[PDB]
Design a protein around this nucleic acid. Structure first.
Ligand code: NA
Ligand code: NA
Ligand code: NA
Ligand SMILES: [Zn+2]
Ligand SMILES: [Zn+2]
Ligand SMILES: [Zn+2]
Ligand SMILES: [Zn+2]
Lengths: 188, 189
DNA sequence: CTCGACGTA
DNA sequence: TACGTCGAG
């Protein structure tokens, strides 16, 4: 084992479950200091409790994949199929089904969905997105969606799919949106 | 013949409105209509002879012509850049035409700014923490990184994840729209 | 040309 | 299952 190499935990290590991926940060004769990426825990682990892994033989094309949140090595079927590439191969979400539970949160409720459906822009109407302010023809030059708050399950507004999928990149969280603002202003 | 809510194109130049500009009929008066031309958001009185009805559902993917999502001019499919492929193997073009993409793309990252960013590039297979979303990742394995740049100046910003980069673009790299997002979210918290 | 990623339908 | 969309590679 060398510094910068990747390993998995062979067994439960305190808070660290087996198959948790870590990077070697220091080595001595019998142990490594390992940063387990999911929990951001740096631990002294005996070599006998670690197994080297080839990170480039994980993910698309392979039988196992490292989750981008928990950074645990899991079977491919532990991740939801989400897209298809130009070669016809299926792409799964980068976060495993367990981690997706926290991301997805509470679904839009039936009664909130009905409230939104009562005021839905008709297909083929001219719509202006309340966020990005772009005009579109509904279902022709932009697709619209029922946005909802995933902490409460309550509806928000009809918005374009582009904006909705943008919100998700920043975790529907004003904290990260404020970080984006500061970042952009720094390089104005 | 023409009805309110029908879609038309300008056959010819109508003041500021170029041919093939898509409009929606907003009022009808004998044989003239008040047409909202969507690209420029201009409401104009137009004689029926200057308009051609179009079927918006026989435009876009699968068809010869497509309406641009910015200028809302009806253009040939090749006026839009191929960008993706769907599950059925069909090619998807960007919703904005090549002309409108010029203004979205702005100034490209300069060669010296690129070389500069390349000298501080996170190594492939290193553990990286995105400066925007704060998510830890393994470079090129659990997240892909990109050279982000300011498209007003052509200068580099930072190495960020592709997810964040493509989020910035959805809001036009413009703090104005990010502020709108904040107030929208706050409103429903 | 090709890419993954998001919350949706 | 699948979708378009973004700045990228
Ligand atoms: Na590989
Ligand atoms: Na949403
Ligand atoms: Na960018
Ligand atoms: Zn996970
Ligand atoms: Zn929008
Ligand atoms: Zn255009
Ligand atoms: Zn990020």
């Amino acid at each position: 084992l060398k510094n910068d190499d990747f390993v998995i935990a062979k067994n439960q290590l305190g808070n660290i479950v087996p198959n948790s991926v870590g990077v070697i940060r220091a080595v001595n004769g019998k142990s490594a200091m390992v940063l387990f990426i999911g929990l951001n825990e740096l631990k002294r682990v005996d070599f006998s409790e670690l197994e080297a892994i080839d990170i480039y033989r994980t993910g698309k094309g392979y039988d196992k994949k490292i989750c981008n949140i928990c950074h645990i090595l899991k079977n491919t079927d532990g991740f939801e199929i989400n897209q298809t590439d130009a070669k016809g191969r299926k792409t799964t979400r980068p976060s495993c089904r367990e981690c997706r539970k926290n991301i997805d949160g509470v679904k839009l409720s039936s009664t909130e969905k009905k409230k939104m459906d009562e005021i839905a822009p008709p297909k083929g109407s001219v719509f202006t997105c309340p966020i990005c302010e772009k005009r579109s023809i509904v279902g022709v030059t932009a697709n619209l969606v029922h946005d909802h708050n995933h902490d409460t399950g309550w509806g928000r507004e009809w918005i374009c799919d582009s904006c909705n999928t943008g919100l998700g990149r920043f975790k529907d969280n004003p904290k990260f949106l404020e970080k984006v603002i500061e970042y952009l202003k720094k390089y104005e």
